[PDB]
Amino acid sequence: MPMQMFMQVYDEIQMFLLEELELKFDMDPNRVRYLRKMMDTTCLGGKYNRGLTVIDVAESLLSLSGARRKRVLHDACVCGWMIEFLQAHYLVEDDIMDPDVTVQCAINDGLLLKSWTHMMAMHFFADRPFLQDLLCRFNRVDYTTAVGQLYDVTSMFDFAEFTLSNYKRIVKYKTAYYTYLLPLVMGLIVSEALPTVDMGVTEELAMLMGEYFQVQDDVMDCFTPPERLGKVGTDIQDAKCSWLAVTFLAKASSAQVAEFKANYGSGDSEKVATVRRLYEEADLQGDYVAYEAAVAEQVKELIEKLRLCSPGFAASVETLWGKTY
Amino acid sequence: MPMQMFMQVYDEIQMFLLEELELKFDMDPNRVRYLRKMMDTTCLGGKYNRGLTVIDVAESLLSLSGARRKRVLHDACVCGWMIEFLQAHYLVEDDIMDPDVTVQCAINDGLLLKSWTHMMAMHFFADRPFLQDLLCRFNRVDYTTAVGQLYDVTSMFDFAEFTLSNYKRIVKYKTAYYTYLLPLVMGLIVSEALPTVDMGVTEELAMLMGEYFQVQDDVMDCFTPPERLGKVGTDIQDAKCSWLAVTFLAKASSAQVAEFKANYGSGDSEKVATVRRLYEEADLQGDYVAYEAAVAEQVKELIEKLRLCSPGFAASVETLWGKTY
Ligand SMILES: NCCN[C@]12C[C@H]3C[C@H](C[C@H](C3)C1)C2
Ligand SMILES: NCCN[C@]12C[C@H]3C[C@H](C[C@H](C3)C1)C2
């Protein structure tokens, strides 16, 4: 029922957007089918964890507070696709980062994908009291993410910034807000229970879960072989401010730092291997286990303060945490 | 007073955005001064016709309807910078269209410039009744523009689309809405006189003025020498669906069309010259004078229907039309 309802609303949303282009923007059939294909390509095929989290938060708060149920569940599905379309937008912008009409069209796709989040919200929520508050929180998180991307992309320019506090600054702004905080908040807004939750504990839980997720992602990026990871690990070659790099630099010897600094940020297979060798000598995959355990305990503790005053909200945050854990 | 007040609010807006980054987003000084420089580079140096039009519409509707005056004029300046920042955003995206951190940063700049339009509106209008209606109309026009860019960029793929109705479809969506309609509407919203105007005549006037402007721009792009135009004309080489191309194809002989089709869309200086030669033989610069006269009359007529029920609104639309004429 969750995933099948999510896809049914996707069809309903795509139909509205495409017909709006045809009826109001004078779009010809050829371009409408092109945008249908582009929309399907960029928005489908993932796991929908962000979008399904909105649904899971909504179903809890209506059962643990008949016609209002159908409306709140449908809104949740629309909110979930807003975040999924937002995610599509970011991925397209990341592809560009890696008279050419294919680049013109990718740029155009990125803009349309973002605009579609506004168009679908201005339609399906036109008569909701929360439309303005929803758009403002959504836009604020999107800005947050663009700021986190700036931090990420410049973290090796101005190793001074290879610190744990700065790594958390990147993770929180670049990933945690739109991936963990925004799905929860949007489920609260469609359930009209926004002021009934402690946003401090909720923000802290989202920051922690995104941190937990990003550290595991950083370690897998370096040690998981390409065919099992789903991609080729690129953090070392790209000089990324990863959890491994910042943890290494704090426990490395002076000449190990010299060997790291001379090898980091290169595509040469042997220097990349030298970095992997350095990481293993420092027992970083052992520190990784301990670090995730500590965060996992901090997550396990903060969920209980949340349930003291917001019981039903907490079960979905546990469901979301299990998707990460 | 108009331009000096517009720049004073720019300083006030920049200060709020940068301090917000420092106080709320944990941004370090080095990156704040970088974003100050980026903001100044992309947003200043133009003519501010879009932003100053909002001011000119606002000052008319308060004098031709003490504390309310200062508020409406300040709002207008903020609305004007929203459009100017939106214009900065589009120009940066156009530059991209023409592990590289300069491309990463340009992409990031484009996203920030757009987000800043939301951040500055959610701040300075947080207590205004029109905040939601403003954001929805602004977002709709931005979507319109992305759609017009799609039409523009694909007009030579799928010469079938080299038609006058399609040229007007590009101009209207790609340029006219955000350059001519949006400044007028935003002046109406800060003056709270939105339902007091005939939006049909207003939309038609904006479409016409953007058409008038774009035809003159197309002709100058081809015949005005580079040092006098401010740039190198690129429409022929890029196979653009220009006013010259669509007007030529309707009055050309079969072999002149064959000579056009064989020469259009190339960077070879001699084929570009062959296209310019073809354009002159068809007396397109004479048809250009007649065409602009006809539109100019249609503009001169529709401004009077607008003043019948909306007198003060019409003087600013005349001021805006004079900026084009
Ligand atoms: N390397 C991935 C290429 N896939 C693309 C998917 C989508 C957005 C971009 C432009 C096209 C449509 C092709 C990137
Ligand atoms: N060809 C023009 C280069 N100017 C730039 C201005 C602004 C936006 C982009 C990235 C930098 C900051 C450099 C383009």
Amino acid B89 reads H
Q: How far apart are CA B193 and CA B121, in angstroms?
A: 19
CA-nearest of A268, A174, A162, A273 to A217 is: A174
Partners of A116 on chain B (C-beta within 8 Å) are 143
CB B236 within 8 A of CB B202: no
- Residue matched to tokens 């052992």: A286
Q: What is the resolution of this structure in A?
A: 2.0
Task: Yes or no: say if B102 and B95 are a contact pair by the CB < 8 Å rule.
Answer: no
Q: Sign of the C-alpha dihedral, residues B98, B104, B108, B111?
A: positive
**Any chain A CB within 8 A of the CB of B294?**
no
Nearest atom (ligand 2) to Cα of B105: 10
How far is residue B21's CA from residue B243's CA, in Å, rounded to a whole number? 45
Token pair, residue B41, equals 């580079």
CA distances for A126 relative to A15, A120, A188, A252, B129, angstroms: 17, 10, 18, 57, 16
Judged on CB neighbours under 10 Å (0-12, 13-18, 19+), B18 is middle
If one residue of A87, A92, A111, A232 were mutated to test the ligand 1 pocket, choosing by the most ligand atoms within 8 A of its CB, it would be: A92
Number of other residues whose CB lies within 10 A of the CB of residue B28:
15
Q: Are B117 and B106 in contact (CB under 8 A)?
A: no
Q: Measured between alpha carbons, how far is residue B296 from residues A132, A203, B133, B209, B315 in Å? A: 40, 57, 32, 8, 16
Q: Are A219 and A243 in contact (CB under 8 A)?
A: yes
Task: Name which residue sits closest to atom 4 of ligand 1, judged by CA.
Answer: A95
Breaks (C-N over 2.5 A) in chain B follow: 65, 98, 158
DSSP A67: H
Structure tokens at A203: 């923000």
Q: How many whole angstroms separate alpha carbon A108 and alpha carbon A131?
A: 26
- For A177-200, the DSSP string reads IIIIIHHHHHHHHHTT-GGGS-HH
Longest pairwise C-alpha distance within chain A: 68
Please choose, from the candidates B117, B66, B107, the residue with its C-alpha nearest in 3D space to the C-alpha of residue A146. Answer: B107
Ligand with minimal distance to B45 CA: 2
Does the C-beta of A42 come closer than 6 Å to ligand 1? yes
Q: Rounded to the nearest 10 degrees, what angle do helices B311-324 and B182-190 cross at?
A: 150
Ligand nearest to the Cα of B37, by number? 2
SS3 of residue A264 by DSSP:
coil
CA distances for B85 relative to A143, A196, A200, B226, angstroms: 15, 37, 33, 27
Written as six digits, the tokens of B95 are: 């530059």
Tell me the two tokens of residue A65.
């507070």
- Is residue A80 a contact partner of residue A124, using CB atoms and an 8 Å limit? no
CB A14 within 8 A of CB A36: yes
CA distance A193 to A262: 53
Q: Which of A72, A14, A5, A84 is nearest to A42 (CA)?
A: A84
The CA distance from B132 to the nearest CA of chain A, in Å, is: 6
Hey, how many other C-beta atoms are within 10 angstroms of the C-beta on B240?
24
Answer left, alpha or beta for residue B224, where phi above 0 means left and psi between -120 and 50 means alpha: beta
Cα A148 from Cα A145, distance rounded (Å): 5
The interface residues of chain B toward chain A in range 227-266, judged by CB-CB distance below 8 A, are 237-238
CA separation (Å) from A162 to A155, A177, A246, B239?
A: 7, 21, 5, 48
Best A21, A22, A97, A165 residue to mutate vs chain B (most B CBs within 10 Å): A97
Cβ within 8 Å of residue A40, ≥6 positions away: A14
Secondary structure of chain B in the HEC alphabet? CHHHHHHHHHHHHHHHHHHHHHHHCCCCHHHHHHHHHHHHHHHCCCCCHHHHHHHHHHHHHHHCCCHHHHHHHHHHHHHHHHHHHHHHHHHHHHHHHCCCHHHHHHHHHHHHHHHHHHHHHHHHCCCCCCHHHHHHHHHHHHHHHHHHHHHHHCCCCCCCCCCHHHHHHHHHHHHHHHHHHHHHHHHHHHCCCHHHCCHHHHHHHHHHHHHHHHHHHHHHHHHCCHHHHCCCCCCCCCCCCCHHHHHHHHHCCHHHHHHHHHHCCCCCHHHHHHHHHHHHHCCHHHHHHHHHHHHHHHHHHHHHHHHHHCHHHHHHHHHHHHHHC
Residue A25 DSSP class: S
On whether the CB atoms of residues A324 and A68 are closer than 8 A, the answer is no
Q: Which residue type is seen at A236? A: I
Asked whether A260 and A170 are in contact (CB, 8 A), the reply is: no
CA gap B218, B175 in Å, rounded: 13
Distance of CA B287 to the CA centre of its chain: 25
What is the DSSP code (8-state) at residue A244?
H
Exp. method: X-ray
Under 8 Å between Cβ of B122 and A138 = no
Q: Which chain B positions have a beta carbon within 8 Å of A101's beta carbon?
A: 153-154, 157
Biggest CA pair distance of chain B:
68
CB A183 within 8 A of CB A320: yes
Q: For tokens 């757009």, what's the residue? A: B114
How many C-beta atoms surround the C-beta of residue A220 within 10 A? 15
Cα separation, B148 vs B245, in Å, equals: 18
CA dihedral of residues B23, B25, B26, B31 (deg, nearest 10): -100
For A224, which DSSP code?
S
Whether A284 lines ligand 1, by a CB cut-off of 6 Å, is: no
Do the Cβ atoms of B203 and B181 come closer than 8 Å? yes
Report the candidate in A222, A256, A228, A254 with the shortest Cα–Cα distance to residue A240. Answer: A222
Asked whether A82 and A138 are in contact (CB, 8 A), the reply is yes
Report the Cα B180 to chain-centroid distance in Å.
Answer: 7
Nearest 5°: phi and psi at A234? -125, 5
Note the ligand closest to the C-alpha atom of A44: 1
Neighbour-count burial of B127, counting CB atoms closer than 10 A to its CB (0-12 exposed, 13-18 middle, 19+ buried):
exposed
DSSP H helical ranges for chain A: 2-24, 29-43, 49-63, 67-97, 101-124, 131-153, 164-171, 182-190, 199-223, 226-229, 243-251, 254-263, 269-281, 284-309, 311-324
Beta-carbon contacts of A164 under 8 Å, excluding residues fewer than 6 positions away, are A246, A247, A250
Report the separation in Å between the CA atom of B106 and the middle of ligand 2, taken as the mean of its atom positions: 7
User: In 3D, which of A147, A275, A167, A255 has the Cα closest to residue A215?
Assistant: A167
What is the Cα–Cα distance from A35 to A19, expressed in whole angstroms? 11
